[PDB]
């Protein structure tokens, strides 16, 4: 079989990043981007202070990563390629040609690995960079400006708790109705801020409308979103094919050397959907990338959920021990064996099997010597403020032979 090579620019993931070449990247210490953002101001009267317009300055810095790929040749092939011990030139030429073909076939996939892994690194950094929608949306919708007081922040925190409890598996729960899915996809699209505008050539469709981003999914989610929910705009796109390189020369080179500082289409088969009022890509790269390799696909991440159940609670109040009807759970014995305090809990397994945690399982926790480790508690308690309390009930006296 002949391996199918994947180019990074033909993928729809290239619309989420702007690429540029930099030969002197190993000699940077801290690259710096700069922002100057100004804000408008409104005028009022009455018992309000007059306001002045504010200017904000924000500075971000680069983060350096790398890529690695290996390439091996065996000892026999290395001996054949070094032209050492040549003999029988009709029978060793075939072995040398076989070694050359093996080396070329190895080097092809080794060179392809970097273009295959650029998309993986982009997916990893975008997955790290993304806050959850269930926390981003009510925060971006509820507070108008910020610097909230205690009450508004507390109400926002309660609403955040309720929203992250409710909308957690929003695709697999309300999968029967497409309208909720297409309603919250528009929320997810129009809940994030855009980026800067300065560019030369951008990813457009066949007609010429500029696309706004990428929406990467699993293949199951792609077919579920495409079967009835989102509408196809186009099946072709126009992508850039050149990076755009830059170097340092002239006065910038001598500034970097002395001072130590420096200053600065093709037709592709890819689907495009329309969400809200924005035209986005919908890539589900699982066959082009991550197929027949030894790595796991991202977007299959895990979550951790902790469960709590009480075990031996007896309702102390006599009012709370009530039954909904007279003969609910009757027995044969003269004493109903449910008024006794409970000693176990019953819950369901992963597979739906009934399981029981009786009180015998607490022997691993309460029958230890850590139950009698009161010394550090006493040492910490003795360094507090103590008043001279009467000692009638904590004092033992001695006889007097009376």
């Amino acid at each position: 079989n002949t391996l199918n090579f994947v180019r990074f620019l033909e993928l729809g993931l290239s619309v989420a990043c702007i690429c540029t070449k930099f030969p002197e990247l190993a000699y940077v210490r801290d690259g710096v981007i700069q922002f100057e953002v100004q804000q408008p101001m409104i005028a009022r009267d009455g018992p309000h202070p007059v306001d002045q317009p504010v200017h904000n300055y924000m500075v971000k810095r680069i983060h350096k990563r790398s890529l690695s790929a290996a390439f091996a040749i065996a000892s026999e092939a290395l001996s054949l390629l070094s032209n050492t011990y040549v003999d029988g030139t009709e029978i060793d030429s075939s072995l040398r040609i076989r070694a050359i073909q093996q080396m070329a076939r190895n080097l092809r996939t080794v060179l392809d690995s970097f273009e295959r892994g650029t998309a993986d690194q982009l997916l990893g950094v975008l997955l790290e960079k993304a806050p959850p929608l269930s926390l981003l949306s009510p925060i971006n919708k509820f507070q108008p400006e910020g610097h909230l007081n205690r009450v508004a922040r507390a109400a926002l925190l309660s609403d955040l708790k309720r929203r992250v409890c409710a909308d957690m598996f929003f695709m697999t729960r309300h999968a029967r109705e497409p309208r909720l899915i297409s309603a919250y996809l528009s929320d997810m699209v129009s809940c994030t801020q855009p980026s800067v505008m300065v560019s030369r050539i951008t990813h457009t469709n066949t007609r010429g409308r500029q696309v706004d981003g990428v929406l990467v999914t699993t293949a199951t989610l792609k077919r579920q979103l495409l079967q009835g929910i989102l509408q196809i705009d186009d099946t072709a796109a126009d992508v850039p094919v050149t990076y755009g390189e830059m170097v340092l020369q002239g006065t910038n080179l001598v500034t970097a050397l002395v001072m130590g500082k420096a200053v600065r289409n093709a037709r592709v088969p890819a689907d495009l959907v329309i969400v809200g009022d924005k035209l986005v890509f919908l890539e589900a790269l699982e066959r082009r990338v991550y197929q027949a390799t030894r790595v796991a696909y991202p977007l299959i991440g895990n979550i951790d959920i902790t469960f709590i159940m009480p075990m031996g609670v007896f309702q102390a109040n006599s009012m709370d021990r009530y039954t909904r009807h007279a003969g609910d759970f009757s027995t044969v014995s003269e004493q109903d064996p449910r008024q006794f305090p409970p000693q176990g809990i019953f819950f369901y397994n992963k597979d739906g099997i009934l399981t029981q945690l009786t009180l015998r399982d607490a022997m691993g926790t309460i029958c230890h010597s850590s139950l009698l480790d009161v010394e550090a508690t006493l040492v910490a308690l003795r360094q507090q403020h103590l008043d001279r309390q009467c000692y009638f009930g904590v004092y033992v006296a001695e006889g007097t032979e009376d």
């Binding site: 940077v28 210490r29 690259g31 922002f35 100004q38 050397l257 002395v258 500082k261 420096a262």
Partner: protein, 49 residues
């Protein structure tokens, strides 16, 4: 080791290591060091307003 041309010649060569409490930074290398060949810099990638 900036590599710029010298501004002026210096006379009276002596054992400079004897007077180390003068100046503010003193570095002595036997023949050559790996720290002499290092062209690390900082680059500004643009300003947005």
């Amino acid at each position: 080791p900036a590599g710029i041309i010298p501004t002026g010649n210096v006379l009276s060569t002596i054992e400079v290591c004897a007077h180390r409490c003068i100046f503010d930074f003193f570095k002595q290398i036997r023949s050559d060091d790996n720290s002499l060949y290092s062209a690390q810099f900082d680059i500004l990638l643009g300003t947005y307003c």
